[PDB]
Amino acid sequence: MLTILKLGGSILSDKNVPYSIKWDNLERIAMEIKNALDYYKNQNKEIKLILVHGGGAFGHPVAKKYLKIEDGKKIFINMEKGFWEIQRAMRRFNNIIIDTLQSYDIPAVSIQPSSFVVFGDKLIFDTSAIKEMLKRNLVPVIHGDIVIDDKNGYRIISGDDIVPYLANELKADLILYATDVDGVLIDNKPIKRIDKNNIYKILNYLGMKYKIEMIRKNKCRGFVFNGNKANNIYKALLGEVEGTEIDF
């Protein structure tokens, strides 16, 4: 029924190249998603799909201009300008991704967190709109953004936040983390799986820490795999496993 596919801010834009886009990779990814959705239409199987991407070479480079170290602590200043400028950057990125998805007849739509998400001690994030969108078989595309934080003023909600939240808030059947590594790497090897068992000895060794952690905190079950290898995204969507499983 409901799958959430995160596109790791990396396979979409080169983070060391401010304002860059990996066009061919992006166009391939859109195609695989399209082929996947098409596959389901054939099996006459109804699938609901949400998409998340990061700030890639857009969010971060601009955010940077408004983060200064106040004694080992990231601080946002000049947000009278910074809030918009970070919104704008993320909008450019969001537009580019949605347009490309659209060119493949993928019914993508923009979800812009900065407008309504408050990263308060208790995350505030009304999903009413998204649930409706899913009833119409639209594909909400959500992105890491700048958001208000009723405690610290501003925060940079990331995909790793949105994904688990929504998976749980919406009861997602499948969770996908597309990225530039074949899965969670230990000693440079993608562990086949991650449970309640070998978990303990992994948090220690330490998808990164942040993820794994608040994706067990929601008792989720997602796959971390490589979005750069042609066909991986397609397969991932059909309920295959090509990377690291994280069950909770």
**Binding site residue list for substrate:** 55, 60, 159
* Residues 177-206, interacting with ligand IPE (CB under 6 A): none
16 binds, among ligand IPE, a second copy, none (CB under 5 to 8 A by kind): none
164 binds, among ligand IPE, a second copy, none (CB under 5 to 8 A by kind): none
State the Cα–Cα distance between residues 82 and 88, nearest whole angstrom: 10
Tokens 């909600």 locate to 157
* Annotation: binding site: 6-10, 55-56, 60, 159, 180, 207, 211
Identify the residue among 117, 163, 175, 176 touching a second copy (CB under 8 A).
117
In one letter, which amino acid is 64?
Answer: K
CB of 226 to a second copy, least distance (A): 29
The interface mask with a second copy, positions 83-112, x = CB under 8 A, is xx--xx--x---x--xx--x--x-xxxxxx
Subset of residues 43 to 102 that bind ligand IPE, contact rule: CB under 6 A: 54-55, 59-60, 63, 86, 90
In angstroms, what is the minimal distance from the CB of 30 to a second copy?
14
CA distance 77 to 16: 23
Which listed residue (33, 101, 111, 145) binds ligand IPE by CB under 6 A?
145
Specify whether the CB–CB gap between 52 and 6 falls below 8 A: yes
Residue appearing with tokens 């796959």: 223
CB of 195 to a second copy, least distance (A): 36
- The interface with a second copy within residues 13-72 (CB under 8 A) comprises none
Closest CA to 160 of 4, 3, 6, 50: 6
User: Total residues at the site for ligand IPE (CB under 6 A)?
Assistant: 15
Partner touching 63 among ligand IPE, a second copy, none, CB below 5 to 8 Å by kind: ligand IPE
Token duo for residue 142: 């959500």
Of 86 and 106, the one with the shorter C-beta distance to ligand IPE is 86
Touching a second copy, residues 162-221 (CB under 8 A): none
The residues that touch ligand IPE, with contacts defined as CB under 6 A, are 9, 54-55, 59-60, 63, 86, 90, 144-146, 156, 158-160
The residues that touch a second copy, with contacts defined as CB under 8 A, are 79-81, 83-84, 87-88, 91, 95, 98-99, 102, 105, 107-118, 124, 126, 128-129, 132-133, 135-138, 147-150, 152-153
